[PDB]
Amino acid sequence: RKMAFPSGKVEGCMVQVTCGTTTLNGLWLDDVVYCPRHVICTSEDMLNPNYEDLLIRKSNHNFLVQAGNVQLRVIGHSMQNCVLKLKVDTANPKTPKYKFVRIQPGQTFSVLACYNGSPSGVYQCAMRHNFTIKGSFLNGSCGSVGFNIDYDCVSFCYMHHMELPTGVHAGTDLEGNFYGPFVDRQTAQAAGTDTTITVNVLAWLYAAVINGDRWFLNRFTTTLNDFNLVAMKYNYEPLTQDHVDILGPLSAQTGIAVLDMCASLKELLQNGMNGRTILGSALLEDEFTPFDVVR
Amino acid sequence: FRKMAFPSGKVEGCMVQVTCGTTTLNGLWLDDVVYCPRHVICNYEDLLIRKSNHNFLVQAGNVQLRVIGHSMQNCVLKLKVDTANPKTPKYKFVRIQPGQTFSVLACYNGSPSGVYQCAMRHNFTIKGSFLNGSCGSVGFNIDYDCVSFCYMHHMELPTGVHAGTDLEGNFYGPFVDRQTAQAAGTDTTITVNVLAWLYAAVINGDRWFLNRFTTTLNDFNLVAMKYNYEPLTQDHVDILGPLSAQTGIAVLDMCASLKELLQNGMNGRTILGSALLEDEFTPFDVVRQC
Numbered sequence: 001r002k003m004a005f006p007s008g009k010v011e012g013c014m015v016q017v018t019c020g021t022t023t024l025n026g027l028w029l030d031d032v033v034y035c036p037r038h039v040i041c042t043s044e045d046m047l048n049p050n051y052e053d054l055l056i057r058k059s060n061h062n063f064l065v066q067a068g069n070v071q072l073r074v075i076g077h078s079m080q081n082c083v084l085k086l087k088v089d090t091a092n093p094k095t096p097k098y099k100f101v102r103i104q105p106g107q108t109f110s111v112l113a114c115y116n117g118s119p120s121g122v123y124q125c126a127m128r129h130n131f132t133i134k135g136s137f138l139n140g141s142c143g144s145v146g147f148n149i150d151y152d153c154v155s156f157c158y159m160h161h162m163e164l165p166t167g168v169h170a171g172t173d174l175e176g177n178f179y180g181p182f183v184d185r186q187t188a189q190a191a192g193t194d195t196t197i198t199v200n201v202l203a204w205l206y207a208a209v210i211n212g213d214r215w216f217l218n219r220f221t222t223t224l225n226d227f228n229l230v231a232m233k234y235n236y237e238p239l240t241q242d243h244v245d246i247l248g249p250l251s252a253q254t255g256i257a258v259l260d261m262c263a264s265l266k267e268l269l270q271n272g273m274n275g276r277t278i279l280g281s282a283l284l285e286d287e288f289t290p291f292d293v294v295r
Numbered sequence: 296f297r298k299m300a301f302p303s304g305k306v307e308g309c310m311v312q313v314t315c316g317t318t319t320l321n322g323l324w325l326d327d328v329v330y331c332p333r334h335v336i337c338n339y340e341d342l343l344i345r346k347s348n349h350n351f352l353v354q355a356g357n358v359q360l361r362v363i364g365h366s367m368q369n370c371v372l373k374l375k376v377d378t379a380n381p382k383t384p385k386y387k388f389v390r391i392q393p394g395q396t397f398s399v400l401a402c403y404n405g406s407p408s409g410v411y412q413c414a415m416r417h418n419f420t421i422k423g424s425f426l427n428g429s430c431g432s433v434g435f436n437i438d439y440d441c442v443s444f445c446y447m448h449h450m451e452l453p454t455g456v457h458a459g460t461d462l463e464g465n466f467y468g469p470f471v472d473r474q475t476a477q478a479a480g481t482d483t484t485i486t487v488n489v490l491a492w493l494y495a496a497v498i499n500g501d502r503w504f505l506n507r508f509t510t511t512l513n514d515f516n517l518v519a520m521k522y523n524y525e526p527l528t529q530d531h532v533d534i535l536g537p538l539s540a541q542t543g544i545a546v547l548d549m550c551a552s553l554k555e556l557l558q559n560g561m562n563g564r565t566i567l568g569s570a571l572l573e574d575e576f577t578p579f580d581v582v583r584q585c
């Protein structure tokens with residue numbers, strides 16, 4: 001199954017941030033609360049916000065931060081790209097071991113969807129090649145974060161800012177730099193074409209072979225370039241030599257060469273599933289990474 | 296629309312490692328009792344009279360808990376320990392019905408590893424992902440700071456699905472906690488959940504499967520029972536009320552759409568990006584998330 005990381009380490013960091021009439025979520029790490037800078041926007045500012053002008057007019061007591069039933073005193077603030085950083089009185093005693101990381105397309109992570117600073121649900125996500133995520137976010141979800149947890153270290157990789165017209169979602173890393181060409185501005189924007197994440201599909205096929213189903217395999221191989229000419233006709237992401245190297249370990253474990261598995265995928269795309277499933281799924285899964293399958 | 300699990304933090308603070316002899320699995324530490332599958336001691340009455348407190352090694356992180364008593368309740372072993380869990384949440388033990396969903400905190404060696412969302416199938420299995428040291432992992436729902444524990448994991452059936460007990464040690468389904476040939480019965484699609492998921496689809500603007508027709512229970516059930524769909528009881532219709540009143544599609548209007556989806560298939564089309572009919576969202580799940 002697709003699994004999220006246990007969310008408790010992140011739950012203890014979620015707070016509520018209110019400026020004026022606007023309330024969203026913030027991430028409380030040590031003595032800093034991180035949140036999307038459009039918390040300082042009103043209704044009139046969403047189209048063409050001048051954030052430096054909006055922020056200079058704010059003072060520390062304009063920001064109401066609430067950790068459960070406790071108000072936290074904001075003692076300073078600064079903006080870093082598209083995130084606001086609120087310095088507060090008190091270091092979060094529940095701060096886990098953490099780092100900020102910026103991820104690449106194809107990477108997976110867990111999202112803790114929060115409202116009013118309280119956790120609502122957790123799910124697993126992937127960064128798509130058009131730099132959106134297929135999330136589940138409602139009004140007030142901004143400042144919900146995405147994360148991985150490898151060996152008790154929480155790596156924060158995503159903070160939620162906006163929903164695009166196709167229902168997909170855009171946001172920043174925790175330094176406030178957007179993934180993709182989007183802007184925290186209510187102006188006309190749209191995601192580019194969302195390709196299937198080929199390297200993930202291939203890792204998932206290798207996962208299927210390891211678990212014992214081999215029905216989709218065939219006797220052919222292919223060149224890298226021939227694979228990409230076919231796969232791009234199905235809106236699959238071109239496969240690079242680095243992707244081939246990445247799948248190396250799985251190819252070593254199963255004894256199936258990477259370009260051999262590529263020929264199997266070409267045939268799957270041509271034939272469909274014929275009413276079968278591969279790992280309980282009747283579609284080709286592309287939000288499971290080569291690193292995920294080994295773990 | 297995603298499959299969403301409950302935030303797991305309240306449960307993570309209850310997970311411990313239990314070792315008896317060469318066998319290690321997970322335990323649930325609430326107040327001063329650790330709950331775990333009785334097969335950690337591997338005839339269970341005779342195996343347990345021969346066990347003493349010192350046979351049980353309970354580890355909560357870097358701390359060992361001293362067992363000061365033990366007893367069995369059905370298929371769960373209850374180890375009384377010296378110290379109450381300071382992280383014990385508000386909680387209750389509940390037994391869920393087929394079709395109901397819950398979150399699973401998959402654990403190994405007492406340490407939480409992943410969280411996912413499951414449904415109790417009508418053959419009383421769950422389609423989880425559990426590996427060799429996962430026993431004692433639990434399933435749960437949260438309602439406004441109260442954790443309802445409903446599942447503890449015991450075993451994997453040959454078809455790759457899973458069987459366990461409630462927290463009072465009563466199995467779900469016709470299974471026994473011993474290593475012998477057992478198999479899941481014929482499963483079935485959870486009709487009220489599929490209907491819930493179609494309502495979630497129309498809420499999201501996926502409306503191509505709607506049509507002008509309505510059906511009847513017996514008409515629908517007659518078509519359902521040939522496609523192995525769980526008979527749509529009159530009860531099920533009640534629960535979809537808020538969805539039916541919200542969208543404008545009466546349940547039997549939607550059942551007409553579901554009925555025709557079982558015949559014509561979907562024609563390469565998707566509903567919420569799925570080529571199959573999803574049945575692991577309850578009506579309440581859809582209201583919660585939407």
Ligand SMILES: CC(C)(C)[C@H](NC(=O)C(F)(F)F)C(=O)N1C[C@H]2[C@@H]([C@H]1C(=O)N[C@H](C=N)C[C@@H]1CCNC1=O)C2(C)C
Nearest residue numbers: 038137138139140141142161162163164184185186189
């Ligand atoms: C949905 C929409 C029309 C509103 C708008 N989108 C675009 O302007 C775009 F289409 F350009 F992206 C949009 O999201 N916002 C407009 C305004 C902020 C953002 C916003 O409301 N963020 C929400 C934070 N709580 C999360 C949203 C709520 C619905 N579901 C979500 O995830 C900002 C870009 C500054």
Ligand SMILES: CC(C)(C)[C@H](NC(=O)C(F)(F)F)C(=O)N1C[C@H]2[C@@H]([C@H]1C(=O)N[C@H](C=N)C[C@@H]1CCNC1=O)C2(C)C
Nearest residue numbers: 334425426427428429430449450451452473474475477
């Ligand atoms: C998988 C298998 C051949 C082993 C066996 N199954 C059947 O005997 C059945 F098919 F009859 F169910 C089985 O599960 N067990 C054998 C023995 C316990 C249980 C068991 O090892 N439980 C594991 C707990 N840590 C979780 C398992 C590990 C693999 N994936 C899981 O979920 C018990 C019934 C007492």
